Structures are given as C-alpha cells and as structure tokens.
Amino acid sequence: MEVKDANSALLSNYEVFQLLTDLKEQRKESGKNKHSSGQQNLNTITYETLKYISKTPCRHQSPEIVREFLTALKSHKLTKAEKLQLLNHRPVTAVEIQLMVEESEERLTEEQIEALLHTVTSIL
Amino acid sequence: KRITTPYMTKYERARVLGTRALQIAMCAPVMVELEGETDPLLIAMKELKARKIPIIIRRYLPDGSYEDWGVDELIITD
Amino acid sequence: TEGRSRDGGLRLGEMERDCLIGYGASMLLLERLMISSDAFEVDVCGQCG
Amino acid sequence: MFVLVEMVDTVRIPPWQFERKLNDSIAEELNKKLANKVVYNVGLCICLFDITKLEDAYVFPGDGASHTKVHFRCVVFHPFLDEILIGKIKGCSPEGVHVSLGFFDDILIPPESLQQPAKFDEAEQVWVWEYETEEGAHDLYMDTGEEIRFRVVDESFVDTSPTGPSSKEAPYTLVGSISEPGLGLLSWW
Amino acid sequence: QGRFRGNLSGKRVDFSGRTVISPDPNLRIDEVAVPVHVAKILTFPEKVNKANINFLRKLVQNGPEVHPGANFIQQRHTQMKRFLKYGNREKMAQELKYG
Amino acid sequence: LKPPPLFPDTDYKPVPLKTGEGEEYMLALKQELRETMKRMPYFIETPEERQDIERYSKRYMKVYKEEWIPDWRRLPREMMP
Amino acid sequence: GVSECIIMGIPMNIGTGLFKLLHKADRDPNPPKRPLIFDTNEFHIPLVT
Amino acid sequence: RCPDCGSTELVEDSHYSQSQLVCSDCGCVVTEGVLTTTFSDEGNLREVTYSRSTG
Amino acid sequence: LILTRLLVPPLCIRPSVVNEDDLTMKLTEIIFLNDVIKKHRI
Amino acid sequence: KEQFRETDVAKKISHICFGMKSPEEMRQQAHIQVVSKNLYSQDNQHAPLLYGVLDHRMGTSEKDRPCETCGKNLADCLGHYGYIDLELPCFHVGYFRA
Ligand SMILES: [Zn+2]
Ligand SMILES: [Zn+2]
Ligand SMILES: [Zn+2]
C-alpha cells in the first residue's frame, strides 16, 4: 500500500451523498454473507455517514443547480475554499459570512455581502 | 508480431498442468464436464486436451521484452 | 535424523540434486529440499539489513 | 471536509472467486480492507471512489490465487484548519466539552475556546454558561445537545504502532473553537 | 561434514522409504509395486472440494488401519490436527467441509 | 560477578576555570557570529514548499528577497541561477 | 545462479522456472472513470492576479 | 486438559515414528514433534563436574 | 579490522551437551585469561 | 476505530551484502555482557549463572526452560547475542594477510 497524492482534489457533500446513495442502492439487494467483520465496518460507516448528511442543508441539490450557483459565484472573486464552505453550509444571516470570509470587512463592502446572502438564500 | 516457436515446450506443459491442478484442488470452477474423476491432475489433463485451460503464458526474452501466448493457440503435441 | 535405530529419513545426495537439475524440474527440487526438510520462517529488518 | 486521495496496492483473488468479473471482486476486497480505518497521514477513510487502472493478473508459483496491482482513488474524511463544522455533543469534561460528529467522536472544545465569563460549574460536570445582561448564569450545555456550530483550530496524529516485542486512545484528534459570535447552540442566534 | 557440502547442498528428507527389490514381469514399464505396510505409513494430504467429497468420506470412515483409509484430519480454520485412532465416532466424515 | 558501573570514579577532577573580561568579550563575539550568519543569502535554507490550500494571507506574509548573484566572471558559465 | 537459488529456498531460473503465467480472467483495464460534478477544472481560477 | 473438550484424559502416544500428545476422548493433538541429539554429536560428549562448573 | 570485542554465538547453534560444546570451553578460557591479565596488571 | 496497517508484508531476497562490524556496532547488537568464567550456580538447583556464559537471555537449548529475553520455548526461539569485552586488542586470523 502506497499513496501517490494526499490532496488531489476537494469534494462537495452532494457528491459524497450521491455516492453513498448509490452504495445504498446495491446494499440489501441480496442476503448478507456475514463473511467477516469488514461487512459491519463498511455498513456502520456508510449508514452513519448517510444519517449524518441526512441532517444537512445540501440535500435535494442537483448537479445543474450547483454548477449554475458556482458559475454565478465565479464573478465575486472568492477563493475556491470559500466557495466550498458557502455551498456546504448555505449561510442565512450576515454574521456567519462575516466569519467565513477572511478579511470580510476589508475585501467586501456591505452591498456585496448582501448580494452574496441573497444569492445563497435564493439559488440553493 | 511473434517470433518464438509455436510449439508448447515440455516445460510449459508441466507448469501449466501443475498450476491448473493446484487451482482445481482449491475450490475452483471446472470448465469441462467431468465424468466422475476425482484426481485434480487428470481433470487438468482433460481440460488441456479440450483446450479450455484459462491460463496465459508470457515468454520473457533475455533483453527484457516478452510475448503473450494463449494455451489454446500453442501446438500441443505428443 | 540419520539411522534406523533412531527413525531415519533417506538422503537427497549431491548427485540427485544434479539429476533433478538435468531434468529441468524447478519446483520439484524446491519441494524436496526446503518444503519437506527444514522450512523455517524468520523476520528481517530492512533498515539495517 | 472530505478529500480525494490516490492509492496503489496489490490484491489477492482466491480461486473460488474466479467466476465473478475481476473489477467487482477486486473493489469489494480492497474496500473490505480499507473501510472504517484511519491512515497515519491523510486521515479517516470512508470508501473507494473509483478504480482507474489494472495491471496484469500474475499467478505466482506455490499458489493458486491471482495477484493484481491496482490504481484507485479513495474518499477520506479530513477537514482542514479553520473549517467550521456542526455536530452533536457527546459529553462534558473538566478539560472541555466533547463533540460527536455522528461517525467521528474525537473532537474537544477546551475552556479557552469557551466564552470567558463561564469557566467552571457548581461541581456538576455539565458545563454551564454565563452572559452579561441576559442568561444570568443559568444556561448549560446538554451532554447530547443539538448540532452546535464550531470551528476547528487544531489537529494531530498519534502513532499506535506496537513498541517492543509482541506477546487505546483514538489515533486521530481534533480541537474546536466556539468563542466567536454565532458559534455553538443555534438557539443563541 | 561442513555446512556447505553436508547440509545446504544435500540434506535428509521425510516421506521416503527404503527396502530390498525383487522382479515382477507382470507390471507395465511405468509401475512399481509398493508393500501394504509402507502404503500405510506414507500419506499424501488431499484438499477437500466438490469433486472428491465422498471418496475422502469413505477413506475417513475406513480408519488408519485398513489400508484405503486416512490417518489425520485438519479443520478448515483452526490449524489443530485430529488423529483418527481416538475418533470414537464416524461423524468426522459427516463433518468434513470444503477446506 | 557484576560488571562495573558505566561511570567509574575518577580521582583527578577537572582543573578549575580561567576567567577574564577579555574572555567574556570573546564569548560575546562568538554568540554574535552565531546570531548573524543566519541573516544573508549565503545561509541557503530549504526552499519554501508544501502549500496546503488557497488561503489569503500569502498576499502579505510572503518573504521577498533579491536573487543573489556573485561576480560571474570569476566562476565558470554552467551555474546560472 | 542455481546454487544460490537452491541454498536459499527459491525456484531456479532454468527449466520450468524461465517463464511466467497469467490468469485469463474476464477483466477490463482502465474502466470508465467515475465522473465528478463540483471540482471540474473550468470553474476554478486563481484569485491572485 | 484437552483444549477442545476440556477432558483430562490426555495420553502420550506415538504413531509409527511420530511422538505426540493426544486427547484420548476427542482425538485432538495438543503437541507434536521432538528435537533430539543424534550419534554425530553423541561421540563428542565431554564431562564437567558441577562443583567445577560452580567455582 | 583489528578486533577488541567478540559476539558470543547464541545458545541454539551450540547445544547443551557437546558436557557443553567446545566453543563454550574456548569462550570460558578466553574470559578466564582476560580476568587473569586484568587483575595481574592491576 | 483503529489505525490502518498492512496485514501482509511478504517480501523476497534480492541481494546479499558482505561486510564487517565496528566494536560499537557489535555492542549495539548484543543483549548482555558476559563477564564471568564459571557456568552454573553453587546450589544443586544447577541453574546457569546470571551474567556468565550459558545465560538463557541468549537463547535456550533445553526443552523445559524458556528464554527470558522472549517468552518462547526451545522450538520457537530465534536466538540472541551477547558480547565479551577484550582487555588488550588482538589480531584476527582471517584478516591477517589483509
Ligand atoms: Zn533493524
Ligand atoms: Zn478432547
Ligand atoms: Zn529468545
């Protein structure tokens, strides 16, 4: 076992949820063999992660809406990391955006923050 | 293209038979219908006769290159 | 062990080794000389060798 | 928080698995091998993302199984520093508050991260809260609680490799922060 | 008698026997006649599978004294052996599993 | 029956020191050397590497320094920086 | 050499030990890659000018 | 005690040439194989009085 | 390339009764001579 | 939840490098320092001396006494090394020509 890259790419919680949903689709389709503890390892981790994400706002998202959202967000000149937390959390009041963006007051003025708030509350 | 001889040398025959017999000894599907034999080596011999053994030979040349031959396209002779 | 007073075990001499080399059978003399004589398992450190 | 990593390995396929297509059995085997474990450097692994490329399936002498080398990508849990997460409380301790993330449990909120006026309770382990005008030193955080908001500020790996000839703490640790307004119980905001 | 000549290059092995030889012109040129006494001592480990479940069951039932029978059994998972002289029951043969 | 302790006792002990104001002055000088030889390009440290994410602070705290070059007429022509 | 292979318990390189065998399993190298939605290249541009 | 059935009826017994310790009630083998010096070293035996070996 | 220490071989390559193997006799006589020379020089 | 590790670590010999051992390195190899001439203890229990030769922290050769360095009996002990310090340096036979 050897790792070639440790940070190749980031991911959105929607994609992880889609993969786990697919895993659920080929889960319980046949009688469990109970061959070894790896069954319970895999089942527990997948079920727990699914249940956790089942209490997140990113649910009911779809690929097209997220691509359009990030296309619109392209022009606002934020870092990719910022964009991912905005997509993952869906902020609803100003203060959490004040905290999220580094140098929020200096880089963005009030009207721009209001624009971000409206965009996130409307698109998602 | 391929340059090595098309005949299956006796060493290839020996090792293919042995490896397939070991595979059959462990629980592995048998390609050809078996009459009731119980010795894995005889079953491997029948699989070779019917040309159904699922093994691929890789003839390594001393310079480093190699050629892949399927068991069913060598000339198995006496 | 060696004798018949003690339970024995026959010897694969230095000439049978050359006969088996001559036949070209590579797994059979491995089975004769390691698997069924003194197959032992050790552990080696690759850092110091 | 999830991250994608690239991986290489070799997988053994016992002969009785020869009937099934290789791409499925190999994935099942290595996902069996890797699921619900934490690597020393990249963090906690969830499951295989996808397989990218396969080498030839050699059969080694003295064996019946076929060994194949695998190139594949795996999804792993590894939030980065200053990231904000929401998670349920697990319990209270004198050194802080432990937060459970559903599947991950080693998250701690030290009292330094907690808001200053509250620093100890009335000999009851349930951590209490204080505030200037309202909340007259009567609010307290439940050991289960809701999904409080917090930001990670520290993280560390610890080795569990055996020491000395042969014959319990989690190897992955996280620390969070709650001081900033809007962090913690959503009922506060 | 040193290591290289005596031990490494050629060494003693087990599962082998020695005896006098005699003629028998009623055999083919690729057969050898083995005494029943030596047949009962040398043993070959057969792996159990779908092809020969019943043959090995009969051999186990015969026991270690009547010639077409077996001496030892190894469980599929636990490495411990089982010596058929003190078996007390035929149900070993029923208990045989693949492996 | 028992091997001796890893430290046997020695009767001749370290002869006392020899101190002086000039010796303290030298002590200073050496501490100063130790301090200053870290503050020029000749102290070639390992190049900055292993960036983590696109954090914003790199607009400011990135260290800036000129590409040091000696007189190249006195050195062969195979090591252009 | 033959002698070293014999006195170290590994198969020799002449006779039945000169070639390698593969398994003719039903397999598909470089399969269709799982596609990714969010992290597509064209939607990332460095923020530094 | 036999690890498989717990009975205490262990009997030391040897097959044709193999020494072993067998549970006489379930056939399990708990310990097999011995390591014994042979004639080749039997010819070299010396003697040291223990009093000498003890100083 | 000039020696000042020796590794004493493990027990397993020198059985209990050769009573004991001759390598043990050689080792004991060496250490005896070492103690002799040490105490006598002192 | 437990740290990942490799279950199988099988490997193969590829090269053998001959060499020598420095005195400090062969000290590092050893487990104990043999110091005494005698072999056994005064009493009739006949247990071998502690820091003398025959100490079982260097293995074992009896079917009933386990090695103390590793809790394994004769059939399973790989063996261990001790070292003897030499009080005057001496030459080596095989290396004299060198
Ligand atoms: Zn080492
Ligand atoms: Zn029993
Ligand atoms: Zn030991």
* Sheet strands (E) in chain G: 20-23
Degrees to nearest 5, angle at CA G3 with G2 and G8? 100
Report the C-alpha gap between I6 and I26 in whole angstroms.
12
Q: Which CATH superfamily is domain D3-77 in?
A: RNA polymerase Rpb7-like, N-terminal domain (3.30.1490.120)
Going from the C-alpha of D100 to that of each of D108, D147, D174, I33, the distances in angstroms are 9, 9, 11, 70
Per-residue exposure over I3-42, b if at least 16 CB sit within 10 Å of its own CB, e if not: eebbebbbbbebebebebbeebeebbebbeebeeeeeeee
* Closest to E93 (Cα-Cα) out of E67, E66, E65, E56: E56
Contact between F56 and A102 under an 8 Å Cβ cutoff? The reply is: yes
Residues with Cβ within 8 Å of residue E24, at least 6 apart in sequence: E33
Residues forming beta bridges with residue B56, ordered by sequence position: B70, G22
Report the C-alpha gap between F53 and E95 in whole angstroms.
61
Q: Give distance in angstroms: CA of E55 to centre of ligand 1.
A: 51
Residues with Cβ within 8 Å of residue E22, at least 6 apart in sequence: none
Q: Which residues of A touch G43 (CB under 8 A)?
A: 67, 70-71, 74
Report the C-alpha gap between D128 and D139 in whole angstroms.
6
Report the C-alpha gap between E4 and G4 in whole angstroms.
11
Report the C-alpha gap between H39 and H41 in whole angstroms.
5
Report the C-alpha gap between C10 and C32 in whole angstroms.
11
* Closest to C11 (Cα-Cα) out of H43, J49, J26, E7: E7
Closest residue on chain G to A80 (Cα): G44
* Closest to H28 (Cα-Cα) out of H50, H48, H8, H46: H8
Query: What does the DSSP assignment read for D22-89?
Result: HHHHHHHHHHHHHTTEEETTTEEEEEEEEEEEEEEEEE-TT--SEEEEEEEEEEEE-PPTT-EEEEEE
Strands D66-77 and D2-13, by their bridges, are: antiparallel
Backbone φ and ψ of A25, nearest 5°: -65, -40
Going from the C-alpha of C46 to that of each of A1, D106, G8, J7, the distances in angstroms are 17, 35, 18, 17
Contact between J45 and J36 under an 8 Å Cβ cutoff? The reply is: no
- E3 in a labelled binding site: no
Q: Residue H11, Cβ neighbours under 10 Å: how many? A: 11
Q: Residue B58, Cβ neighbours under 10 Å: how many? A: 14
Degrees to nearest 5, angle at CA J31 with J30 and J37? 90
Query: What does the DSSP assignment read for J43-93?
Result: STT-PBPSSBTT-GGG---SSS---SSSS--GGG-----EEEEEEEEE--S
| 3-state SS class at F4 | coil
Report the C-alpha gap between A77 and B19 in whole angstroms.
63
- What is the distance in angstroms between the CA of the first residue and the CA of the last residue of chain D? 24
Contact between D114 and D178 under an 8 Å Cβ cutoff? The reply is: yes
Residue with structure tokens 């490495």?
E79
Burial class of residue A26, CB neighbours in 10 A (0-12, 13-18, 19+): exposed
Q: Within chain E, how many helices (H) and strands (E) appear?
A: 3, 2
Tokens of A39: 């069954």
Q: Does an H or E element contain F17, and which? A: none
Degrees to nearest 5, angle at CA D141 with D140 and D147? 150
* Closest to D69 (Cα-Cα) out of D112, D126, D121, D26: D26
Report the C-alpha gap between G37 and E82 in whole angstroms.
59
Q: Which amino acid is at F7?
A: F
Residues with Cβ within 8 Å of residue D63, at least 6 apart in sequence: B22
Alpha helices in chain H (DSSP H): 39-42, 50-53
Residues of E with CB under 8 A from a CB of H: 41, 71, 80-88
* Location of each CATH 2.40.50.140 domain in chain D: 83-181
Q: Which residues of G touch C40 (CB under 8 A)?
A: none
The resolution, in Å, is 3.3
* Sign, Cα dihedral of D106, D107, D111, D113: positive
Residues forming beta bridges with residue D72, ordered by sequence position: D7, D51
Report the C-alpha gap between E2 and I25 in whole angstroms.
21
| 3-state SS class at H21 | strand
Q: Which amino acid is at D19?
A: E
Report the C-alpha gap between G38 and A84 in whole angstroms.
9
- Give me the count of residues in chain I: 42
Residues forming beta bridges with residue D85, ordered by sequence position: D150
- What is the distance in angstroms between the CA of the first residue and the CA of the last residue of chain G? 63
Report the C-alpha gap between E95 and D60 in whole angstroms.
32
For residue E86, the 8-state DSSP code is G
Contact between D6 and A8 under an 8 Å Cβ cutoff? The reply is: yes
Q: Residue E30, Cβ neighbours under 10 Å: how many? A: 5
Tokens of F48: 């900055």
E49·B25 Cβ contact <8 A: yes
D37·J71 Cβ contact <8 A: no
Q: What share of chain E is helix, strand, coil (3-state, %, to 5)?
A: 30, 5, 65
Query: What would the CATH number be for the domain defined by D83-181?
Result: 2.40.50.140
Q: Which residues of F touch A79 (CB under 8 A)?
A: 54-56
* Location of each CATH 3.30.1490.120 domain in chain D: 3-77
Strands J2-3 and D37-39, by their bridges, are: parallel
For residue G3, the 8-state DSSP code is H
What would the 3-class secondary structure string for D110-169 be? CCCCCCCCCCCCCCCCCCECCCCCCCCCCCECCCCCCEEEEEEEEEEECCCCCCCCCCCC
Tokens of E31: 């057969």
Report the C-alpha gap between F58 and F64 in whole angstroms.
12
Q: Which residues of C touch H36 (CB under 8 A)?
A: 1, 6
Report the C-alpha gap between I9 and J59 in whole angstroms.
10
Q: Which residues of H touch E88 (CB under 8 A)?
A: 25-27
Tokens of B6: 């098309």
Contact between H9 and H2 under an 8 Å Cβ cutoff? The reply is: yes
- J80 in a labelled binding site: yes
Backbone φ and ψ of B76, nearest 5°: -75, 120
CATH code: domain of residue B1: 3.90.940.10
- What is the distance in angstroms between the CA of the first residue and the CA of the last residue of chain B? 27
Residues forming beta bridges with residue D140, ordered by sequence position: D128
Query: What does the DSSP assignment read for A52-113?
Result: HHTTSTTTT--HHHHHHHHHHHGGG---HHHHHHHHHH---SHHHHHHHSTTHHHHS-HHHH
Residues measured by CB to lie within 5 Å of ligand 1, the ion = C 45, 47-48
Alpha helices in F1-81 (DSSP H): 21-36
Degrees to nearest 5, angle at CA E65 with E63 and E70? 45
Report the C-alpha gap between D10 and D72 in whole angstroms.
11
Tokens of E4: 């290289």
Tokens of D68: 């194949």
Q: Which amino acid is at J19?
A: G
Closest residue on chain G to D58 (Cα): G22
Across the beta sheet with J82-90, the strand order is I3-8, J82-90, J32-33
Going from the C-alpha of D129 to that of each of D86, D119, D121, the distances in angstroms are 19, 8, 9
Going from the C-alpha of G32 to that of each of A14, A16, D51, the distances in angstroms are 21, 19, 9
Going from the C-alpha of J79 to that of each of F75, G7, J60, the distances in angstroms are 59, 21, 8
Any CB–CB contact under 8 A between A79 and chain F?
yes
| 3-state SS class at D91 | strand
Contact between D34 and D48 under an 8 Å Cβ cutoff? The reply is: yes
For residue F3, the 8-state DSSP code is P
Burial class of residue J76, CB neighbours in 10 A (0-12, 13-18, 19+): exposed
Q: Give distance in angstroms: CA of J33 to centre of ligand 3.
A: 16
Burial class of residue D130, CB neighbours in 10 A (0-12, 13-18, 19+): middle
Note down the domain range covering B6: 1-78
Backbone φ and ψ of E41, nearest 5°: -95, -50
A4·D46 Cβ contact <8 A: no
Test the A interface: residue of F56, F57, F59, F60 with most A CBs within 10 Å:
F56
Contact between E51 and B38 under an 8 Å Cβ cutoff? The reply is: yes
Report the C-alpha gap between J77 and J71 in whole angstroms.
8
Q: Give distance in angstroms: CA of J5 to centre of ligand 1.
A: 19
Report the C-alpha gap between D53 and D71 in whole angstroms.
5
Degrees to nearest 5, angle at CA A112 with A110 and A117? 95
Residues forming beta bridges with residue D184, ordered by sequence position: D149
Residue with structure tokens 């050499």?
G1
Per-residue exposure over A46-66, b if at least 16 CB sit within 10 Å of its own CB, e if not: bebbbebbeeeebeebeeeeb
Going from the C-alpha of D137 to that of each of A1, A42, D132, the distances in angstroms are 54, 44, 9
C24·B11 Cβ contact <8 A: yes
Backbone φ and ψ of A59, nearest 5°: -60, 160
Helix axis angle, D22-34 to A38-53, nearest 10°: 80
Tokens of J62: 């009896």
Q: Does an H or E element contain I36, and which? A: helix I22-41
Return the partners of chain J (3 or more C-beta pairs < 8 Å): C, D, F, G, H, I
Report the C-alpha gap between B77 and B5 in whole angstroms.
13
Residues forming beta bridges with residue B75, ordered by sequence position: B7
Closest residue on chain H to J42 (Cα): H54
Report the C-alpha gap between C1 and C10 in whole angstroms.
9
Q: Which of G18, G21, G24 sits opposite B19 (nearest CB)?
A: G21
What would the 3-class secondary structure string for B1-15 be? CCCCCCECCHHHHHH
Look at chain B and report how many structural domains it folds into: 1
| 3-state SS class at D3 | strand
Degrees to nearest 5, angle at CA F31 with F28 and F35? 135
- Minimal CA separation from G10 to chain J, in Å: 9
Report the C-alpha gap between A83 and I13 in whole angstroms.
69
Tokens of F15: 């002869």
Residues with Cβ within 8 Å of residue B38, at least 6 apart in sequence: E51, E52, E55
Contact between D1 and D79 under an 8 Å Cβ cutoff? The reply is: yes
- Minimal CA separation from D62 to chain G, in Å: 10
* Sign, Cα dihedral of H44, G7, G1, B3: positive
Backbone φ and ψ of C37, nearest 5°: -115, -65
